[PDB]
Amino acid sequence: KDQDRKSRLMGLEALKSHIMAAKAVANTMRTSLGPNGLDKMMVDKDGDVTVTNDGATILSMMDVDHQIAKLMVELSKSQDDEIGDGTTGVVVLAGALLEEAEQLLDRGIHPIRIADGYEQAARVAIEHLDKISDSVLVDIKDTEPLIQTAKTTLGSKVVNSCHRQMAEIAVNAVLTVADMERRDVDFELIKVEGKVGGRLEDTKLIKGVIVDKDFSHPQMPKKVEDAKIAILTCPFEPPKPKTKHKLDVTSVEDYKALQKYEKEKFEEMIQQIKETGANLAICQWGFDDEANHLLLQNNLPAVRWVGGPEIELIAIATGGRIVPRFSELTAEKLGFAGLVQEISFGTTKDKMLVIEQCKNSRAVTIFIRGGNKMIIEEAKRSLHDALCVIRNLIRDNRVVYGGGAAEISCALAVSQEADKCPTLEQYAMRAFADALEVIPMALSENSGMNPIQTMTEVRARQVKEMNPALGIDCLHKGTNDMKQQHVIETLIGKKQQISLATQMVRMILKIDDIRKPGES
Amino acid sequence: STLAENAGLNPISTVTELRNRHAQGEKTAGINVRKGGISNILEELVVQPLLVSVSALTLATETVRSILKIDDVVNTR
Amino acid sequence: VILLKEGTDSSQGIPQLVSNISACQVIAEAVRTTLGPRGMDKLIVDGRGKATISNDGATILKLLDVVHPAAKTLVDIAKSQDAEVGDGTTSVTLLAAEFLKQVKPYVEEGLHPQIIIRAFRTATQLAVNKIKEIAVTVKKADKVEQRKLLEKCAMTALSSKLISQQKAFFAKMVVDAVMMLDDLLQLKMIGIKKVQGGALEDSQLVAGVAFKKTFSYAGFEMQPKKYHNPKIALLNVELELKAEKDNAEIRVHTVEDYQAIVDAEWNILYDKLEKIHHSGAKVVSSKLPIGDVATQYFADRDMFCAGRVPEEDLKRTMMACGGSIQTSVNALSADVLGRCQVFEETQIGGERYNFFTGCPKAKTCTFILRGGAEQFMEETERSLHDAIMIVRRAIKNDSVVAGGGAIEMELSKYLRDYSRTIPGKQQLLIGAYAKALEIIPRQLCDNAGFDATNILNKLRARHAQGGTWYGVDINNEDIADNFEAFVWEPAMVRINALTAASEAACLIVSVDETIKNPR
Ligand SMILES: Nc1ncnc2c1ncn2[C@@H]1O[C@H](COP(=O)(O)OP(=O)(O)O)[C@@H](O)[C@H]1O
Ligand SMILES: Nc1ncnc2c1ncn2[C@@H]1O[C@H](COP(=O)(O)OP(=O)(O)O)[C@@H](O)[C@H]1O
8 A cells, every 4th residue: 555656766866875874874973072062952842942062962853754764763752862972973983974874875885795894893992991991990999080080071061160169979879879899880860940030050969859848947957867757748737739729618617627627637636747757748739837846846847748649759869759638647657867858048948848868868860040040051961961971981991092092093903804805895894094094184164273294293103203192182271191281081981882883884774675655 | 997898897896905905915806707707817927017107106296296386277379 | 339349458379478478577586586595685765764684585475465466476476385394495496487488489480379288287297206216314313413414504594694603502592492392392482582791702692481571660579489289370461550541530629538439449440450369370461561469469468570571482382371361350260360380589680580491382482592683683684484394304305405496406407318319399398497406506506696597507517417406505605515514495485486487487487467346
């Protein structure tokens, strides 16, 4: 059915057409590579306007209707969870490998043979990266250089104004949820949130759970020491529903009875706090001024106007249980915490609920403040790089020098080993070397320098001047040798960068027919 | 690759195989059209003088350098 | 004014047959590059824009649904081959179009279609007789255990792949998963799940059903993870507190009435929770999420609970345990409740994976993969599914022949040498039938990036000197004894491919006119 107007194209004309689409996605992002990358003006469907150079955000907003380009976006969706930093490096490298592959199709190479050639060269590159790697925190748990390296990458984003305070926060979070000995960090437990107001320096790390809610009365204890956290759906007062009140009195005989239920239940409900021994009373709907009177004399802290899902978030962290009705009240369902406090952000009366365990718990969240919503969001993704950076640093202390030093060193090894490949993949191995050089060649172009002259000069220095790898000085600092500049990327980052790029090239090279039925 | 094409061989696999034989061996490895495949040319007694290969690169490169230096052509009268 | 057709489009004779021959080659071209394990993929887009990537010939033809009359004949023939066998649709599709291509110039030269049918019906029976005479039975060759030979056939498909360095481990996982099943073997029963990260050797093989278990609600330090004979409950109920399926909303002024509304709101959920308790369910599970409040009820009453289970995993456990997935909790009883022998909650890769081992109807299992990315697992997923079929085929049918087009070249030698002794018009046709068998070893070379000329000429020369099992090697660009290399296929499955191919070509050749009611 619907064979009319069906897509029909195969052979080299189809592969070159597929390669043409991937190059457009790469060339669009090749300029946004590095700290000197050119931003991209994104207009949302709702009419908003945003500007950034994040490779991940560019691909999420880039709604390319071509199918080959969609696979390039699906690839980057997984990279954000593994590498974090070089999302543009994967797409830029894939476009380079496909562009060089087009020269091979004219020579008469099969796409599957090029796929085997890149897989062989990708193993040579991954083997070479471990040789030129270096450790940081080997055989010792240290916090000083772990703050230093993560601080360098953050300096490019909008967190540059207070970049130092963010790096120390990302260390205590991962150090809290995960142990450096086991070296198995869980990025899912490290949440992220924020609110407009204050400045970037006001970002904090909550060892526990945080919900932007205040006490039922300002005279409540600013620090709750007792570990008796009663969580309910209704407040300890004459009960009201969770959805809507809709007060419509009928007559006075009913109204005067409501006054009786006040004195009857305000004392009885708050007496239940003493019968069971609860101290911090968390509840969906808030308290009236009457219950605040009884709560203050006995030093009974309590939260007010907590949301639907906000209730469950505290029970998971504190290990408590929800008491949806007062008949189900008991001592076993009460939460547990070391100390709960109220953080009043200076002149701004935020008064956020801060339930802490007084130790390194298995749940943390970094609340990013800021005077501009556009700077907070770009700062939220800036910190996201530090997490995956610190995650890979702990999972593997081995790291390699960034700035394109690794790509140039890998290209030399692949070029030498290509001579030892007596088969048609020899032309493909050479193409992998030239494609690796596009990442450093792109940083030189984006910095306003001659790409080729800067490319070959660094490569000759990696052989003639000295054997250790040397990078490109994109920030116009003193000189090359990024080891002095302290610009170092994770070994797991580069290994997955060229691996995901090769896997996408093989997946695209092994497709020669995009069939779609047309509307007749 | 042009010699391999004329000899019925694959233009790529012929030069791709010979580039490994030259990395490991010497210049004796070359295309033998009499037998239809790669063979040790030193044994086949198929040689040429050195001036042919040297004068070819010398005169060809000078022509390429000359053609590269042409910025434009002017029609006189 | 007065015409005979009046919209009835009809053409007859040689032009109609030649039109159907060319239309059949279009279906061949759609599945020509997918022949073999290393065949190129095909991207298909439905009406909604959803993409579909797959190198399976059967799955491609189902999504096309070509409207040409002659093309539908091959598709329905190939679809029947998929339902009966599930493999060989591409070989049947390619051979049929190739039988039609080789007899194309003879049809144009005035040769009758019926004379061509006598050649296919004759050459087919001679080929089927040659397969059984040359085929070989392998049950206990070399006094080697079947577990070891099947390991060789499994790693053969997995050779020179992304898991080539550790295929010894992966090879055993295929033989183990197949041997776990009963006499009735099927590919759908043995499921597979993907788990990103970790070494390739860490791929686990659960004997029962397994799933990610994204359920991270409260309920820890309770709900014992071990049961001897639990009454497993499978539902689709949402027992969440802040649930859209179970909630109450009443708005009045009397605060005394809110004392009943907020309490009756929970009493409704308690009547549904108590119905689960009275039913005797021990290991309760549901597709929809379950809240923290409900888990406390399961904890206070010493009951297990694990929600957010996919329906496929639940239905896979349904056929394994033998229960029933009941939507409403009111009909939950012993009729729908399942059973199992040993249940345990493990720690595969840090996350918890529930699984019931030794179920009463345990005809299924699950294989959890591990790797550095999805493409390591997806590429591994494709090769293992055929590895299960290879092991599943060798045990069923002991008579096999050399794959990789080795049998196709032997028949080409027999039929071609036989055609010379057959005087008449059958000579050119039986020989044309022989050359059509060259496409199977040819496209395996073209799709693998090899030179089909150098291989086919070197391959056809080996069969003349005495070769009978030599064929195409997708790994090394050279010929190899596919029998010694344990590249086997069932002889009866290959016999049904030639029969369906000739029967499909005969239907197209026997047709001379197309008729179309104007509608
Ligand atoms: N301070 C720096 N000095 C030199 N090169 C850098 C520096 N920071 C980043 N780079 C280079 O820029 C490239 C992209 O970095 P980054 O912006 O973190 O990833 P992406 O561009 O994918 O978002 C990396 O390959 C890295 O080598
Ligand atoms: N490891 C192998 N080596 C050589 N040939 C193979 C190998 N595996 C499969 N083949 C060949 O690929 C062809 C197609 O196999 P398969 O995909 O199972 O059937 P279909 O292509 O009809 O779906 C078969 O004719 C077989 O000879």
